[PDB]
Every structure is written in structure tokens, then in C-alpha cells.
Amino acid sequence: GAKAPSDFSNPNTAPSLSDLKKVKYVSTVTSVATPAEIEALGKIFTAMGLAANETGPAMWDLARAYADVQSSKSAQLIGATPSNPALSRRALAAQFDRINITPRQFCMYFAKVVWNILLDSNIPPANWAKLGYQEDTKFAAFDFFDGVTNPASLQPADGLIRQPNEKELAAHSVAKYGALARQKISTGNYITTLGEVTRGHMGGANTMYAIDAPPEL
Amino acid sequence: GAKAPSDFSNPNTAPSLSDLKKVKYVSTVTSVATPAEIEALGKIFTAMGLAANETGPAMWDLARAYADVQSSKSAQLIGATPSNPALSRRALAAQFDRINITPRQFCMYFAKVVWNILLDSNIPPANWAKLGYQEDTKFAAFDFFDGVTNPASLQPADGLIRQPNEKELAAHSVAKYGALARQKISTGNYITTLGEVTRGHMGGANTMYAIDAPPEL
Amino acid sequence: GAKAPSDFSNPNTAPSLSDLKKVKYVSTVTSVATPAEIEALGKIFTAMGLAANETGPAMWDLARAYADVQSSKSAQLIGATPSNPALSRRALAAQFDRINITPRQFCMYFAKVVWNILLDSNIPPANWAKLGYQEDTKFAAFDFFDGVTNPASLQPADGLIRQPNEKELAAHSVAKYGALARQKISTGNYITTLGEVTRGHMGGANTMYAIDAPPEL
RNA sequence: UUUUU
RNA sequence: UUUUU
RNA sequence: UUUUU
RNA sequence: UUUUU
RNA sequence: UUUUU
Structure with a gap:
């Protein structure tokens, strides 16, 4: 019965808003990297040297490097990728500027993946005593921690191991x-x-x- | 003789109210999960991996996991389903957020089923000494205990094994x-x-x- | 007659719930160590030095060390195992972090074993005057006392020597x-x-x- | 290791 | 010389 | 002229 | 060894 | 007789 969405005035309804809003977009905020650009970054890494079989784990290893030393332009990642020797993570860190992407924006894309591959072991980030995080919240002592609480991250099928507590967010807020x-x-x-x-x-x-x-x- | 329910004033009567009130609804309070949404959750679990032969017992095992460690967002259920290996109960615990359902709302649906499969044995919940429940009311020491006293639970044909005593409710009230x-x-x-x-x-x-x-x- | 557990709606019954619920799981709460991980800890202790003949008693001696000085990260157990010299209990206390297990979680696994090997003699824990336990409840003055009241402990064939009284639990509650x-x-x-x-x-x-x-x- | 209406 | 969920 | 774990 | 909008 | 990122 209800028709004419081109009127630009009429009220929207539940069944229309459920299906016309095609997942809005995803959660494309400028502070986090979009999946279209990283797909091209997957192409350039395979073009530079990598195989198409193993690409994602090189991103997760690079994200774990950003998990240890905090995300910055003078971060200095210092290390070779586990895929093969010679290819340094500095080269992957330098390649971000070609496609107009910041590392800070890039690392929030794998914030849930970092949280999964960090929390499964009993290993914390490299530095949590300097920033002033407590031993209970030592796992949360890293940049792109806000990437776990938003929809922009990939959110794998198994899901997160645990929902972060309010004490981790409050400690991360004052630490910022x-x-x-x-x-x-x-x-x-x-x-x-x-x-x-x-x-x-x-x-x-x-x-x-x-x-x-x-x-x- | 008595007619015209569209008047919006006239008094209702016993035979009309007995049959026109089609079981009201069921007992659809927002604090407990409706049977329509869990039917879709039965579909997604079978779509994810489960067989259509065994589904309900995976819900009851998951409910018994919520019976042990209390219902929360950071509950951390830690265990594989008895149907098959690899499929963790964490994956089923993570899937609730897709359909806008809380675990606290979900577990009250099987509160009578938990009470049946708990009380038939002499096994209590995992933790009843910390919360401060007495040995007589140790079986009642678990979340979604109010799910036994309302109509929202499935209430199987055999019925409950025993009606909960006032001492269990009074202990559960002050413990909350x-x-x-x-x-x-x-x-x-x-x-x-x-x-x-x-x-x-x-x-x-x-x-x-x-x-x-x-x-x- | 009653069939179709894949419907995800139908009521469960007594004979089905008795046998389909394969002992639920055991009582796998995150506050207590699972038997799968300690089996790997049995392997690493035998790999480090111990014989396969005597392993469990080294766990019970280590549990009796945790019974004396209370369970913590800075507990400081200070002593050699009765199996052989050189191998300190500090090395076994340090090894827990490799498999993502807390000592507090580990010691509740042998809480019934500690209670058995404590109560058979007239010897209490090392410190019960500081915490404020009475002479009648001096045997109960130790951490992982909630491990006796739950199913997660090993519960040996002979059973417990005595069921703990309510005065021990009430004293342990306020002492916490x-x-x-x-x-x-x-x-x-x-x-x-x-x-x-x-x-x-x-x-x-x-x-x-x-x-x-x-x-x- | 009970956050709600 | 009881930090949790 | 009780500092701890 | 958290620069933003 | 703590210089950093």
C-alpha cells in the first residue's frame, strides 16, 4: 500500500528500512582501512614477491609487529617476513604511502585478528610497563585496541575469544x-x-x- | 444475544474472553528469547555444521554450560560440543549477536530443561560456595532460575521433577x-x-x- | 514414538536427557584446570627429568606446597621435590605459563587430594592465625577450598574423609x-x-x- | 565467574 | 603470604 | 621499640 | 616506541 | 651516575 520513496518527505517503515538499507555500507570510517584498498595491497605484495597461497598471514604477522611496537610513521619494525628471507617488513611498511593509507588505519583492520592470535597464548605485547598498564590489563596494552569494538575489523567465523572488559577500555583511554x-x-x-x-x-x-x-x- | 465488539466500550464476558484471547500470546517478555528466533538459530547451527537429527541436545548442553559459569558477555564457555569435535561452544556463543539475542535471554528458554537435567542427578552447578548458597539450595545456585517460574520456558510433557521451594527463591533474590x-x-x-x-x-x-x-x- | 530432535522446539524427555547428555562435559569452569592440559604438564615434567612411575605424587606435593603458602604469582614455593634433588618446585611453578594455566586454576584440581592428605594427619596449613581462622576451622585455612565442593576435582574412589561443615565455608567466605x-x-x-x-x-x-x-x- | 528494559 | 571471568 | 611474600 | 578528521 | 623510536 505504502509507495513513493521519491517524494522526499514521507515516513520510512520497518520492512523497507530492513531491506533497502543494504547493510548501510559496512562501517567505513576514515580512521580505518577499507577492504578495497588492502585487496590492491594484496596484489602488490604478490607482485613484489609473495605467493597467492600465503598472503593474509603476512598481514597478520605485520599486524603483530604493529601490536608490539606502536603504530607510527617512525615505528621502525625491523624484521623479515616468515614467508621468506630478504623481504623485510620495512618494505611493506614503506609501500602503504603509494595507495594513500596510514599504518594506524591499516592495523585496525586486523585488530580482532591480533586480539585472537595474542590472547590464545599467554604472551603480552613487548612494552606494557612504560605506558602504565596493570598486569591484569597487560594484553590490552597496544595501539588499535578500538579496532576490536567496531565493525570495520574482519570478525572471523569463530569470533573473538573474549569480550574486552571496561577496565581495559578505561586503562586504554587514560593511557592515550x-x-x-x-x-x-x-x-x-x-x-x-x-x-x-x-x-x-x-x-x-x-x-x-x-x-x-x-x-x- | 450480546454483539458488537467494535463499539470499544461494551463489557467483555466469560465465553468470549475464553476463546477470543488466543492464549494471549505465550509469555513474550523482552527478558526471555522467543521461539521464532531460536528456530532460525537452529537453522544456522545446522547450516554451520550440525545435523538436523541432533540440534536440541546441543542447545541443552550449551544451556548446561551457561548453568555452570553464569550468563554474561565475558562468560568464556571453553569447550567442544558433544555432537562432534572442532565446533566449539564459543562459536555458538558468538553467533547470538547476529540475530539480536542476548545469552541471558536465550538461557531462560531452557531453564526448565536445565532444571530437569540437573535435578535428575545429584550433581550441582560448578560454583555455589562463592555466591553464598546453602547446601540445601545448592542446586538453585545458577542464573536464569526465574526461567523455571514463568511460562516462557518449553515446559516438557513429563513436567518439572519438583516445584522450587520459597527458600530457593529467597536465597536467589539476596544472592542477586x-x-x-x-x-x-x-x-x-x-x-x-x-x-x-x-x-x-x-x-x-x-x-x-x-x-x-x-x-x- | 517421540522423534525429531532436529526440530529445535519439541520438548525433551527423561530417558533421552539421561543418555544424550553424556555427563554434560565434566564441570569445565575457567576458574579450574582441565584434565587435558595437566596431561601435557605430566609429559613435560617427565620430559624435563621425572620418571613415568612417579608423577602424580609430585603434583600432590606441589599442591601441598600451594596449600601452605597461598596461591599467587609471587607465592615463592622454595623447596626441592621429594622425587630427586636439584629439581626445584620453582621450576614447576614457572612452567605453568607455557600452557596458559594459572596456579590458582591448577591447585583446585587437587583440592580434594590436598584435603585427603591434610585431614588424615593432625597437621594444619602453615598460616591460620594471621588470616583469622578459629582453631576448629584451622584445617580449612587455605586457598582452593572451593575445589572440594565442586565436581572439577578428581574425587578418588575412597572419597573424602569428611564433608566440610558450613562454619568452614562461612569462615572461608569472610576471610576472602x-x-x-x-x-x-x-x-x-x-x-x-x-x-x-x-x-x-x-x-x-x-x-x-x-x-x-x-x-x- | 547476574549490565539493562 | 586469594588479582581476575 | 611487626616493612614485606 | 597513539600526530590528525 | 635512564637521551631517543
């Missing part, structure tokens, strides 16, 4: 602001660089004030 | 408020998470005050 | 909350650690307030 601010004190509140604005100085006057005086630069 | 409050003291009275509101702290100052001072946070 | 809170006052309600959040301070302002003022941090 703590780690970002700790960096921001060293060379913050200026954008020009150059040398004329910043006559010398460059870095701030340490993070030692934070423990003594609440206000910071 | 005790178990919920015990959790609530650890990270209660805040919803934002994030890290800016909760600067650190996170957890409360233990449940050891409860035994000494009546008022709590 | 007392011991946990006593620890929680020292470095509680914060998860980041690090040094920036906790400028100094670290520990709370003692448990001496508990005896004077009911509310605590």
Missing part, C-alpha cells in the same frame, strides 16, 4: 591522553618549525612538573 | 543483589569511561567496608 | 573478603601505574581506620 601529553610536552604548541620562531629551546621544560604542579605548558 | 553490588563497588557510579573524568582510581575502595560500615559508595 | 580488602587498601582504586597519575603516595592510609571508622578508601 597520558602518552600523547607526554609527547606533546616535548615540542608542543608550535607548528611553523623553521628556526626563526623557535630561536632555540625546541623541547618543553620536562614532564617532571606534572607530578608536582597540575598545570602544564 | 549481593553479587550485583559486589561487582558494582568495583567501577560503579560513572558511565563516561574515557579517562578524563576518571583521572585514575577506577575501582572503588573494596567491599571490606560492607562487613564493618553499612553505608557504601 | 577480609584478605582481599586488606591487600586492596595497599595500592587500590588505580590501574595505570606509570608514575604521572600516582605522583607519590602509592599505598593507602592503612587498614587501622577499619577498626575505628567503617567507611574505607
